Amino acid sequence: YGYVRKVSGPVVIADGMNGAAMYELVRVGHDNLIGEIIRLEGDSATIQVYEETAGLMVNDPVLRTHKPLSVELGPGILGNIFDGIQRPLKTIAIRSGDVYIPRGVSVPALDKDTLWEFQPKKIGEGDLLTGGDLYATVFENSLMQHHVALPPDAMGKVTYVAPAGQYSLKDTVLELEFQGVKKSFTMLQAWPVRTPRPVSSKLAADTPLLTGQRVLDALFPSVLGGTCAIPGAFGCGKTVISQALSKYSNSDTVVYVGCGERGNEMAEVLMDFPQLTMTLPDGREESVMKRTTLVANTSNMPVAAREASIYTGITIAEYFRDMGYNVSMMADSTSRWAEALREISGRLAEMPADSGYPAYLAARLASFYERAGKVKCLGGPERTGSVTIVGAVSPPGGDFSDPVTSATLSIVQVFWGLDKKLAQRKHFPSVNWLISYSKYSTALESFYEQFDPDFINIRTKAREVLQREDDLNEIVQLVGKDALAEGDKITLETAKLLREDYLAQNAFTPYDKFCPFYKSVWMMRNIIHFYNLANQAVITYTLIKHRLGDLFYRLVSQKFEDPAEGEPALVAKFKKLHEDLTAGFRALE
Amino acid sequence: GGDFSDPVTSATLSIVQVFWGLDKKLAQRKHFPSVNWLISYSKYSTALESFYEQFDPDFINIRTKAREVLQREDDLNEIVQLVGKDALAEGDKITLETAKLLREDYLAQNAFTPYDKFCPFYKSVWMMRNIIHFYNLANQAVEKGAGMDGQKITYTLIKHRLGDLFYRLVSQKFEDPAEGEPALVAKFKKLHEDLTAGFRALEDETR
Amino acid sequence: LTLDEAIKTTNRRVNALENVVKPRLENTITYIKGELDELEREDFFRLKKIQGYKKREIERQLASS
Amino acid sequence: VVPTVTMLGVMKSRLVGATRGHALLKKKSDALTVQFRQILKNIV
Amino acid sequence: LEVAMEYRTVTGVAGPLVILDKVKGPKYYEIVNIRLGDGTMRRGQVLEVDGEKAVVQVFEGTSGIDNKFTTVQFTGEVLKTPVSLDMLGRIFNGSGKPIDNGPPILPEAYLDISGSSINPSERTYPEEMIQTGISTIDVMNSIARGQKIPLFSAAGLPHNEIAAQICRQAGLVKRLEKDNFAIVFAAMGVNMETAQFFKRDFEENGSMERVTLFLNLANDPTIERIITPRIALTTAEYLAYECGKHVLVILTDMSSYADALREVSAAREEVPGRRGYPGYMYTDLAQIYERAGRIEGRKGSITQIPILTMPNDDITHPTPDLTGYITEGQIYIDRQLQNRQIYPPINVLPSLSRLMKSAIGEGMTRRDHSDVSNQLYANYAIGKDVQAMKAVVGEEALSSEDLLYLEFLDKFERKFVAQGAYDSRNIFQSLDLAWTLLRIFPRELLHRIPGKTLDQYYSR
Amino acid sequence: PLFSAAGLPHNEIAAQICRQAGLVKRGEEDNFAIVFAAMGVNMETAQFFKRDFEENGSMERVTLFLNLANDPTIERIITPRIALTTAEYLAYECGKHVLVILTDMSSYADALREVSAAREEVPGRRGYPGYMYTDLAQIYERAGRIEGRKGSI
Amino acid sequence: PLFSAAGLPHNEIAAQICRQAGLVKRLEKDGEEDNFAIVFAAMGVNMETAQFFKRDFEENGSMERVTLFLNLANDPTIERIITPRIALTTAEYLAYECGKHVLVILTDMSSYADALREVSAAREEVPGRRGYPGYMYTDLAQIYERAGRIEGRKGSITQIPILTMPNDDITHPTPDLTGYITEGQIYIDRQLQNRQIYPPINVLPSLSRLMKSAIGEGMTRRDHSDVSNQLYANYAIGKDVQAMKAVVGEEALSSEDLLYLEFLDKFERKFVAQGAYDSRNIFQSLDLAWTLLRIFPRELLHRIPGKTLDQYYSR
């Protein structure tokens, strides 16, 4: 019930919708075009329709949905591929057979006829349960067990519990009554993208995001449930860091979110993920897709879907965190999302602000980024998850002055700063140490000292060495290495060794594909301790340089060792090398 | 006074085939025809190939050489604005001399006197050929390097001991068209012969 | 002597001239986009408001008849 | 200076030219410094 | 089976628009034919509809229309262009009506323009190279079947000559690796004189069985200039994914297309967007471009080389800056090179392809492609720097290597880039020329070249 | 005010000033009561403020008006109004001197810009409302000493 | 139109022109009809300026000749959009239908553009550049194109509408349109005023389309065009030389550069400057210009032809 009255491009006016609500999604026309309500002036409505509105007919029916832009969560959310508006691309392609996306597809987000193995918890048929209680878990696939949380805003004494067995989402797995009225819940939960997910308490982040790369792990650490920023426009560093996060990061899940980038780039990345495979610490070999969800909205996709992809991804990440899993979101191109928002604002004729973006761009970016953090779960049993966002930025020409870049730098705690200059100089990590920073180091210092009380001092010494590296750089630039003192020469040599041996990774090489934090810490110790032990001896720089050739080779090889030997063997080898270097530095003095 | 971003200007340049872009800077310097030769263009240069070939089968090459000379001079004007003509070599110096001669002789026209009231195509092409031939011969001479100096020494040699040809070149604009083509053509052919005598007589004693 | 002169010129260009020009470019960009572009939208927005008011007045007058 | 699109283009061109000239002058100064170092070594 | 009603209720004419009075159940983007009082015929498109109202934008202008003698006969359609396999080898007008003195197309299908987007799951990374015959493109800025590479130009620069050369010389590199190549050629808002140039080039090309010249003049109605690239993209999509044929598309002067969209948007009383261009221009250009790509389920592909004019000879203009993000490359035409009388004035050093690595490989093209490309890049840069230094150091103090780089720069500018307008060059002989230029330096001097390649080719 | 770009320790400076605030003493009942407005602060900054204020032991004389970035943008405009009204009541109507603190005034400016752009009002420089001077006056122009009363803001 | 900015003495030079304007033909020119019968129309003028003009006209003995239509700033704004039209109608009647040469001084045309802006805004019309009415060009054409000699009558109308750029620019719509329409442009530069030269007229931006018609051997020295075109070129090239020497140092300049700088100094000091009550005969002005030119050698005088050089290079 409801018929269109005026169709001016994307904007659509439909009469007979007195009961419509603002921002309630609606189905327009026989083709089931999907659009969101904007203005409810009079008894009429106003809808902007995402897909092309060409060919609409006046008095074509309009069908309400009684729900805002929402995502159907539950089993089967992992692995698949979804559009910006939560449209399963893979199943759409299989059903329609052809390649083109049909104008008005109506495939449900998750297949409601597929069977998943279900088994309840030890709860009783007449017990009491509340919102967020974990009443069952499901083996969606191997090694990615999926907990079934009773939806929030739903509570009451238990009435029926489905016994363990094979079931589908259409089955009524749960039924309960709060008052005399009883409600039955399936395995599918719908939640609006704009509304965040209910939380019990925002904890303080207390565990680093071990990305497997030494430069990010030690120099500029990032904590679980913490924002991150990447100036990714070239050098494939964004692809490299995304692959590292998918394969080696501590997160139990990853939710890539791609909006408004080049279509072939998304093709390349979405073909790269299935090829990516990660080995289990127990020796098993798995596929990253078994723990990966992908929301990709190319430029050809409607602008509104491009804007909504980010919120869809963050809501998916929050739902994953609802069962205490550590999940990491990855916004492919926030600049593209901002451009989509700008286009939408221009469609709405909103008053332009700085550089043309709407005045709420900073506010909306902050609202999105504020959802990341380590959070106590809702409902029992007690557990805690985390959601960390590693959303990248694409400043125009590298000038960190655009409002998107400025707001992101103002909100994001940790900025890693990939540099194209290092990429030109053949640097695999490509992380510019001169601009990167980790504002969460003060909070992470508790764990840093618990693991090793000397590690934080080593990090401070390394930061001082990096600061003096540029000083020695202009020193050599203006007068040359001749004017450098023995201590200055030792400091410069140690800085160069750190840059070319530990601060840089080798990625492609099997020995340096993954850098454990243990190996990173031992390498940092074997570098800094040797640097000091050589420093206080000032001894002729040439003499120590000649007599430390074996020590220099050991320091260089302190990163060539493969992780095959494991932590106990590599740690012992690094300790022996450090002791030998200390003996050589002290005895020869 | 307004850049090409003007909507009328952009619309015209999106359609118009030949742009005689006059520059206000040339108007300040009182260069009266005032066409800026860096920003102007003519997309008809390809269709006129037959007419240029039949009139003079070597005009295209001399025109391209003149364009290259003008572009090179405009290019190193910025460098001179920083360092100065001290580092200018023989080739650069001769290129700038030829560019200045082309700018003040060829590209100017009074139009208030019979010298420049109406320049027929033959007179213009003869001026262009004379200037380009002088440039090419001078470049070849300074590249010869005879007399153990050549180079800018040979440039000064041709600008001092051979400067009468230079003055006749810079005054060639005054060939009165009323004298008729058979007379002006003979005069320019004689000037070309005299120019060929130079840079060969100058090379006789090896500078 | 020549190196001193060249270094003085280079340092002056790096410090004074470029850092003089770049603020000028930023101010020129801000004056055009920050003001003229904003005014153009505001002028057109007020014009559209005038048109909407005229249409609403015409409709109300017709309805009152 | 008066702000205009043509003025913005002129200022951008001036900045580009200044950067190019600065690079050229830096190269010249480096060459002169190398020659001066060689002369000092020869004198020593 | 329904004969569309021919309403005669014109109740307002203004500019290009005509407002009908009491149309019963219109369609938003319907297409309507107008029979004026004098009997002449005009075709118009339907813009925003309302209660019984329908604003119609009329082609060919609206002169002579009267509110009591003009009939507006609807159709109930959305401009399904006629599409067939025999559409190749013929020149078409802006709206699709053939102008090659031939018959109208007998269609194998009526595909609606602005086709539905490709499922991103079904895309596949582009592979293999597409030979263009221009050395600067196929050596240092290689092109792969499936890219969307702009050709940024400016007013006065010979963009159309490069367009014609690409249209003629385009071919498949895989000739030596061991004919399904079609070139949908679209030209929007060309000048009146370049129309003769295009007609001549496509009337004596020698490979007419490949090209299809959709042509839209400047004085043709604007809405034709909007529809022309969409018609071309639809025909290319059909010939690629519905006929299994590799397809290349050249869009000429999409800045004119942007201006046409600007003209249409203003007529609908919409507020102008940033810098005058509508805000939806990003969506429009993304819609035009993203139709390319390689489909896993089909053996065909679409590769775009859209030619864009950058006004004021700068990239800050909204159209080039906007299309920079969507695409993955930039092949600039430099004004100074045109002044230097190098016929292809492609500034190779500024130019780059964001995914040129896919075209370079072993199976496709030749093994030494990446090495020679990088060596040429680096050596050109060095030569430019050395020329700049020689402008200020007097050139007497330059070392031997400086003179080597100077002569290499001169040779590269005057023998490699300056390809003739008709000197078709296969990639193999283009690389042979590159090696000819490279072999001047000592074998040990080419630092960027990896081992086992110098020994193979440096011996000539 | 304190002028300090993003990322600078101005929050730490504000916390140190509030915790160490006191009269010249050259009295405790009329001593400095601090009204601490917080317009558009991050959650981590909010927890830091709460913990730092609870640690100094001066909770007995400090009021926090916290408004996170999650809260609605219009609700941020009334936070300084409420904070200054409570300060006015404490100082003039009760006597004790009040040391009003508002963090991230640029967040308040952004809230004003968003609200004005919502209603499509006449824009000043940088798209800000043309009455921003008056609003910043109605916020700032309340500090001072009234003759008949011993308070001070 | 005299282009000026706020603070520059455009009113003073206008009064000087009013007091000094006269015929030149063979230096021969009662002349009551030759008396220019100045019609002065002031729009939006500070009362001090009106008092100044009144006193100057009274003192110069022209009180029986001049005519003043005043629209002071405190006076209603709308009357400023009628005052110049009234003045031009009165000038037309005094010249064409009465045979008197007439001179008109419209003052502060920007104060007329402001009235146009106020009227257009009060009507909710579509704005143009900077919010000015889209038809400002038509109004400016209507207000300027009402001057010029007419074949059938012995009269004439010559107007000097002074203009005030808002921020001392030219891209502003009003000075831009005035430059488009009017056949001339006299530029008064802030740089000259800062250097304390009473006539700050920058001779390089200046332009007169009908300059080639007024001059000539029949009414001026034969070298006038040459002299002007050479001084302009030397001043422009010398300014470029000074700009170059500002960065390369006074030492790096050549002999020609030093000659150009000396020419600039003596041109801006001895030539441009003139007394606030002292005129200069056109032949005296040409003599001064020739003294300025003769700094350079005969070779450097490229624009001047040898025929005029022989009669003037020595004198």
UniProtKB/Swiss-Prot annotation, chain B:
Belongs to the ATPase alpha/beta chains family. V-ATPase is a heteromultimeric enzyme composed of a peripheral catalytic V1 complex (main components: subunits A, B, C, D, E, and F) attached to an integral membrane V0 proton pore complex (main component: the proteolipid protein). Catalytic subunit of the peripheral V1 complex of vacuolar ATPase. V-ATPase vacuolar ATPase is responsible for acidifying a variety of intracellular compartments in eukaryotic cells. This is V-type proton ATPase catalytic subunit A. It comes from Citrus unshiu. The chain holds residues 417 to 623 of 623 of the full protein.
